[PDB]
Amino acid sequence: QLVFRNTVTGDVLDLSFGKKGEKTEAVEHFLNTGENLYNTDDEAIKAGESLFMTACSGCHGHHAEGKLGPALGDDYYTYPKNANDKGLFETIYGGARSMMGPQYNNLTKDEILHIMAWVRSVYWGSADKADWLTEEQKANFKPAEVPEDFK
Amino acid sequence: QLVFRNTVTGDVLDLSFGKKGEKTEAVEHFLNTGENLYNTDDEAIKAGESLFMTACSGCHGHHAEGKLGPALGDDYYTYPKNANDKGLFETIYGGARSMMGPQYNNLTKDEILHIMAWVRSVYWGSADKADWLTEEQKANFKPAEVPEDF
Amino acid sequence: LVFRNTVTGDVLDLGEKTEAVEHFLNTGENLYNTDDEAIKAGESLFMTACSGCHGHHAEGKLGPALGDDYYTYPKNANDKGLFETIYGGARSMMGPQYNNLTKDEILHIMAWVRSVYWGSADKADWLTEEQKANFKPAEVPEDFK
Amino acid sequence: QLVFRNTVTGDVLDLSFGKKGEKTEAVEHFLNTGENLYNTDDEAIKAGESLFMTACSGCHGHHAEGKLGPALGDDYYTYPKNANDKGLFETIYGGARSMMGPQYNNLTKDEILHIMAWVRSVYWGSADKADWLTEEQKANFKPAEVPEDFK
Ligand code: HEC
Ligand code: HEC
Ligand code: HEC
Ligand code: HEC
Ligand SMILES: [Ca+2]
Ligand SMILES: [Ca+2]
Ligand SMILES: [Ca+2]
Ligand SMILES: [Ca+2]
Ligand SMILES: [Fe+3]
Ligand SMILES: [Fe+3]
Ligand SMILES: [Fe+3]
Ligand SMILES: [Fe+3]
Ligand code: NA
Ligand code: NA
Ligand code: NA
Ligand code: NA
Ligand code: NA
Ligand code: NA
Ligand code: NA
Ligand code: NA
């Protein structure tokens, strides 16, 4: 019985709100466990890259290096819960401050998990701060390519 | 095909960018004529509403009333060529200045024509400044409700 | 003169007023546009209040470039309009300045903003026709085109 | 030796340019020790308030609650060195990422210390995490109220 909460207000997120897609295995798994099955799925990561460019790149940069909103590929966080997949989904679904609007009406839950897998795949921060990774994944993790513009 | 120019630099746009698919009838007609077939197709306009909310509403508002970027439903334009569909397409595809980046990597040319059709559908400006409309359309054009957001 | 919000069109509520502020409230004309000392002071206030969002050379960053002849709001090509936009704010991040800055400080900023203009004389609606005829555009910032 | 380093790059900060202003007691003392004399000066806190509204509120909110940039009054920091006065000065002076540009051309070093004193005055986090406070101040610490806009 997971309690999903708004990143800014702490209000409960009603996950039945917003754009309905097919009720996929990744979404049912996520609603039960806060684990994103697409983190390891190369096909899903590819589809997440394309959804991030459409929905996110204008504010976060085509390499998640940050532009108007922050870098999403680094181990620095505005909200520390965004280091884990339950928090990241909450921030995307429910929105945060200012121009970071909720995406519940723009994207299905399955599309958000695709985008989330892609955001994790381009990570260039330290394994020690990667809360979404298992101890096994950390031990075997190489930081991805830093974007130039991250300085 | 016509020559499509970048709104900021005046340089020619590469419309062949990407490998998402082959041109739709609407896209091939638009590249030849600058006319957007979706402007009068209610189904195309609804798909464009959803595409606009996902790609554009963060910076231009959920009613195209403006937020970080300008209102798109009014009859003033920062770039007056955006009152016609050729200009509008060039601005979206190629980008403009500051936070208005090019969309050629975010959206297919067909999705952009879907978005443009929805943007024209919500216009609340005068018929006389609506350069994308035909005289038949201008005679029967009634402005959309001005959103209370703006 | 009646002063209106750039976005809503609502009245702006506008004392120990300077000559420039009294002249501005009666005419919509900014005396500081030709006062080199006032343009220097406006540079320092612009860097404090504006450069974070509009850049150190008014080239644009969060908000638009202010030195070019493209406007989001066409009235910002005249000093009455520009004053309304700064005083009363616009959309999103462009908040009202009426509590942060005096009217006199705003006129200093506006004088500096006009001093770094790099667009066309034709679109410079704050210049008289004789100022246009003797127009000397400022350098175009490297981070703009 | 007290060396000031850029929050993003780690490069030594050059303090000889920007808005020169005047060498003040508070600035000389801070460049020698990393201690902000303005922190306990109610007159300086009031001046810092007006400088923050003019220079900072557009991105950080009128109550330092966050808007486009982070909340500054809470006890979570994107960059944990900002919990001390040396780190906070470095981030303000030399900037951070995305839209947090350097402020050394916008403000004198003295103006920055005024803003910093005001930011510490509105702090609503825990005494345990307020590194800039002496242990007298921390044993006597009363956090400011949480502004509504923080949510
Ligand atoms: C501009 C209109 C934006 C779009 C589109 C998206 N984001 Fe965003 N985001 C933006 C800002 C201005 C901020 C800071 C807001 C705040 O409350 O401080 C954000 C924040 C995020 C975060 C938090 C990051 C952290 O360090 O904690 C995440 C994870 C984030 N945004 C993700 C994200 C994704 C995946 C988007 C596409 C669906 C997306 N954002 C769109 C501005 C904008
Ligand atoms: C924030 C990251 C933005 C996103 C996402 C989109 N737009 Fe935008 N747009 C933005 C700004 C800051 C500006 C002004 C730029 C300038 O050079 O003045 C714009 C401008 C436009 C225009 C020009 C309108 C005019 O008056 O001439 C159009 C037609 C426009 N934008 C459309 C648009 C569409 C359809 C988007 C989704 C695909 C979109 N923009 C995204 C900021 C942002
Ligand atoms: C970030 C928090 C900002 C600060 C501080 C200032 N401005 Fe701004 N400005 C900003 C945005 C995001 C926009 C677009 C808003 C909109 O409603 O479309 C603006 C807009 C302006 C304009 C309009 C320009 C036009 O082309 O019509 C002007 C003249 C303007 N801003 C001036 C300005 C001055 C002088 C400031 C210091 C007092 C200032 N702005 C601060 C974002 C931000
Ligand atoms: C908008 C153009 C901004 C203005 C004006 C100011 N700040 Fe800012 N700040 C902004 C963003 C987008 C961020 C996040 C940057 C990042 O690298 O993550 C910041 C960050 C800060 C911080 C870091 C806080 C932390 O948790 O570590 C501080 C201390 C900070 N900003 C202070 C600050 C002050 C005092 C300002 C007025 C002089 C100021 N900022 C202006 C965006 C913007
Ligand atoms: Ca958190
Ligand atoms: Ca034009
Ligand atoms: Ca106007
Ligand atoms: Ca640190
Ligand atoms: Fe980019
Ligand atoms: Fe809205
Ligand atoms: Fe700059
Ligand atoms: Fe505010
Ligand atoms: Na991060
Ligand atoms: Na970050
Ligand atoms: Na328009
Ligand atoms: Na407009
Ligand atoms: Na302009
Ligand atoms: Na402009
Ligand atoms: Na914070
Ligand atoms: Na903090």
Residue numbers in the entry:
A (entry chain A), D (entry chain B): 33 to 183
B (entry chain D): 33 to 182
C (entry chain C): 34 to 47, 53 to 183
List sentences from the manuscript:
Cytochrome cL (CytcL) is an essential protein in the process of methanol oxidation in methylotrophs. It receives an electron from the pyrroloquinoline quinone (PQQ) cofactor of methanol dehydrogenase (MDH) to produce formaldehyde. The two electrons are subsequently transferred from PQQ of MDH to the heme of cytochrome cL through an unknown mechanism, followed by its sequential transfer to CytcH, cytochrome c oxidase, and finally to ATP synthase in the cell membrane for the generation of ATP molecules. To help gain a better understanding of the mechanism, we determined the first crystal structure of heme c containing CytcL from the aquatic methylotrophic bacterium Methylophaga aminisulfidivorans MPT at 2.13 Å resolution.
The crystal contains four Ma-CytcL molecules in the asymmetric unit (ASU), in which the active sites (heme-binding pocket) from each subunit face each other. Although it appears to be a tetramer in the asymmetric unit, Ma-CytcL likely functions as a monomer in the cell. The structure of Ma-CytcL contains a typical cytochrome c fold consisting of six α-helices (α1-α6) and four 310 helices (η1-η4). Among the structural elements, four helices (α3, α4, α5, and η2), comprising the CXXCH motif, envelop the heme, as found in other cytochrome cL homologs. Each monomer of Ma-CytcL contains a heme cofactor covalently bound to the heme-binding region and coordinated by a metal ion, Fe(III) in heme. The iron atom is further coordinated by the axial ligands, including H92 and M132, as in typical cytochromes. Interestingly, three additional metal ions, Na+, Fe2+, and Ca2+, were also found in the subunit, with the Na+-binding site coinciding with the metal-binding sites in other structures. However, Ma-CytcL contains two Na+ ions (1Na+ and 2Na+) mainly surrounded by the loop between α3 and η2, in which a few residues form coordination bonds with the heme molecule. The Fe2+ binding site in Ma-CytcL is coordinated by typical metal-binding residues H94 and E97 and further stabilized by hydrogen bonds with a nearby water molecule (w11) (right).
